[PDB]
Structures are given as C-alpha cells and as structure tokens.
Design a protein around this ligand. Structure first.
Ligand SMILES: [Ca+2]
Ligand SMILES: [Ca+2]
Ligand SMILES: [Ca+2]
Ligand SMILES: [Ca+2]
Ligand SMILES: [Ca+2]
Ligand SMILES: [Ca+2]
Ligand SMILES: [Ca+2]
Ligand SMILES: [Zn+2]
Lengths: 65, 318
C-alpha cells in the first residue's frame, strides 16, 4: 500500500473506481484536477491504464531547510 | 522572558525604518507559513497567529493540538517574519502581520509533497474554505476573501511533480507571492519548489555578507541565514542557520511591500517574474532594491542581492 497522486479532470473522475483496485481516496483537491489515493503497489499500473487518468505520481518527500 | 533585541538579520534587510509606515498590520494581508507548525501561545507570536491548520497525512485539521509545532523550525521561521515589536524576545521583519501557520512537515521536519500541496491549497482557500467568494477573480488582496498574500516555504525536495507545480500555478494566479528556500546542499541550482519560475528562490548570507557555503546556487535573492536568533518552543528562543532562515526575511519584506501598497492604494502589486526589473511588480521591486553583492548584477551566489525592506517599500509607494 502506497500513497500516489492521480491527475484527472474533475468532471471525469469517479471516486468509486479506486475501491475496485484495492485503494481508497485520501484527499480530493479543490483547486487542481488531482486526487491523493492509497493503493496496493500493483494498482499503480492499473491507474495509469485508465483513459481519464493523465498522470500518476509517487508521493515525494521534502525536508526542512 | 528576555528583554527584546533586534536580531542582526532584521537590521540587515532594513526592516526597522519601515515600521513607521507599516508593521504589516493591514487587515487584508496574511502570510501563510508552510512548515512544522507553530508554538501558537508563544508570548512573542500569539497575537499575530490568525489561523493554525495542519495538512499532515492528507487530512486538514484546524485543531490546535494538530497545528502545534512539535519540531521548532516553524516557530523559528514565523518569528523572523512576525515576532511582535514589544518589550520581550525578538521582533520580525513585519511585526504586526497576520500569520496563517499551515503545518505540512511533521515532528522530525519531513513532509510529503501531497501534504505540502494540500497546504498551498489551504493558503489560497483560507479559513472560509473558498478561494474566491465573490467570483471576481481577485483572490490575494480582495478584502472580501481571506486568502494569504504570501506563501512562505522554508523547505525543499529534489522532485518536480506536475500536480505540485499545478498548485504553485494556482497560487500564482490568485496573486499570491510565493517564496521558498533555495536549499542547503551547496548545489548548482535551487530545490523545488524554489526552482519554479513562479517562486522566489532564496539563498542565505552570513553576518559578514558572505554567501553561506551550504546555500544552493542561482537563487533569485538572498537574505540573512546564519546565526539567526528567533522564537522557538516552548515560549523560548534559539539560533539557527539555513536557507529556511533566509526565506522568512524575504516573505517579511513582501508582506511590508503589499501592506504598504494596500494601505496607500487599496490594491496589491502583481507578483511579477524572475526577469522583472521594474518598480511595477513585487519581484521587480525586490530585484532593483536588493543590495547587489558579489560581481555586479545578478550572480549565482546572491541572485539579485540582499533584500532591503526600506528601499523596497519606497519603490512601491513612489
Ligand atoms: Ca488576504
Ligand atoms: Ca508555547
Ligand atoms: Ca518581541
Ligand atoms: Ca477563502
Ligand atoms: Ca474575490
Ligand atoms: Ca471581490
Ligand atoms: Ca551581484
Ligand atoms: Zn490509507
């Protein structure tokens, strides 16, 4: 189970399609067309395959400076 | 509580002479500091803490318990912007400015890009959860909305993610000046998000006006970032170094510029671009009034130079 960020148009994303691949929604952005989700590692390729999905990005790390 | 001093960095960026014009306490102006949280009851900070949120683990919480600083770094950065001008402690660049503390880094000073992007969103939306309540496209500087006018990020990572950039772009288009630390790896260029065109990358100088060896190169401007005394938990003070300490000096200067400009004109200045050398945008003003150290002109150590609030504000009002 990994956290990824999926870029997908507001009007063509259904929150319910991520349960099917073993995931769940963490946060739906109000201001950009993206959603944070937790999915099994094997689900990443599945997300990419979806036509409505523009990009799947891993959750990277920043540190204090 | 110790008697107030003015840390050397506050003096260096020429903040104290501005205060007769504004201390940043113009009601439409807020600075959002995306960091480890804040010691919200600190005697030298509390009155300027206007909103305390956390986005940790992808859930927005406004509980004080969740927004509290468990590290110290956020409290320190906030103090450099907005420590109160009174009888105790230290004093910020903009000592009357309202602060939104947005907690995006955890107790150990680490953060996910997702939590940071959610933090940026919160700074645009504000307490009311709505970017642009009256639908006029004016967000920063609209007295009807509660969006921050400055987003300050004393943090960085190596990754350039499209969604995080999209969020940066939303903040920019809301009229918000975005300021971020260049990084502490002595690298040839800034970390993200400092490296984005819409964001002011900030390098660190020491008290001799030398660039700090750790400061990532090719910043836009530079500011005090070594031996920086500020607020620190719990209700105390600490001295730190880093591009994270330089950043809030610049955010503070921006807050003074925008406060002074709104006080005079009832509007704010456009953000501007990296190339801007006019007096017509925030960044243009920062570039032209910066103290040009090192080689003549923008250089890879200092960028355009060391920010100076007094001249910045005069350029804004003139
Ligand atoms: Ca505002
Ligand atoms: Ca406290
Ligand atoms: Ca004080
Ligand atoms: Ca709002
Ligand atoms: Ca508006
Ligand atoms: Ca309006
Ligand atoms: Ca120079
Ligand atoms: Zn989960």
């Amino acid at each position: 189970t990994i956290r990824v960020i999926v870029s997908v148009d507001k009007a063509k994303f259904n929150p319910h399609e991520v349960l099917g691949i073993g995931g769940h929604i963490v946060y739906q952005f109000k201001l950009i067309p993206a959603v944070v989700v937790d999915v099994p590692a094997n689900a990443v390729g599945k997300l990419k395959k979806m036509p409505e999905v523009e990009k799947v990005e891993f959750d990277h790390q920043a540190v204090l400076l | 509580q110790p008697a107030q001093t003015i840390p050397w960095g506050i003096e260096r960026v020429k903040a104290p002479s501005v205060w007769s014009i504004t201390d940043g306490s113009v009601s439409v102006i807020q600075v959002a500091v995306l960091d480890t949280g804040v010691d919200y009851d600190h005697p030298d900070l509390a009155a300027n803490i206007a909103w305390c949120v956390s986005t940790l683990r992808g859930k927005v919480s406004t509980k004080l318990r969740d927004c509290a600083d468990q590290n110290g770094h956020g409290t320190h950065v906030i103090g450099t912007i907005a420590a109160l001008n009174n009888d105790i402690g230290v004093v910020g660049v903009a000592p009357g400015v309202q602060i939104y503390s947005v907690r995006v880094l955890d107790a150990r000073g680490s953060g996910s890009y997702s939590d940071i992007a959610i933090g940026i969103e919160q700074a645009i939306l504000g307490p009311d959860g709505v970017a642009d309540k009256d639908g006029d496209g004016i967000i920063a500087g609209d007295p009807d909305d509660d969006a921050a006018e400055v987003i300050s990020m004393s943090l960085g990572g190596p990754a350039d993610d499209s969604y995080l950039y999209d969020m940066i772009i939303q903040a920019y288009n809301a009229g918000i000046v975005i300021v971020a630390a260049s990084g502490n790896e002595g690298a040839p260029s800034p970390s993200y998000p400092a490296a984005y065109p819409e964001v002011i990358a900030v390098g660190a100088i020491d008290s001799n006006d030398n660039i700090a060896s750790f400061s990532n190169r090719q910043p836009e401007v530079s500011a005090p970032g070594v031996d920086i005394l500020s607020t620190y938990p719990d209700d105390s003070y600490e001295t730190l170094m880093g591009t994270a300490m330089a950043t809030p000096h610049v955010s503070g200067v921006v807050a003074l510029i925008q406060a002074a400009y709104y006080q005079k004109y009832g509007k704010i200045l456009p953000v501007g671009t990296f190339d801007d050398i006019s007096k017509n945008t925030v960044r243009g003003i920062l570039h032209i009034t910066a103290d040009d150290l090192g080689p003549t002109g923008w250089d890879a150590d200092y960028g355009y130079g060391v920010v100076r609030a007094a001249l910045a504000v005069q350029a804004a009002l003139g």
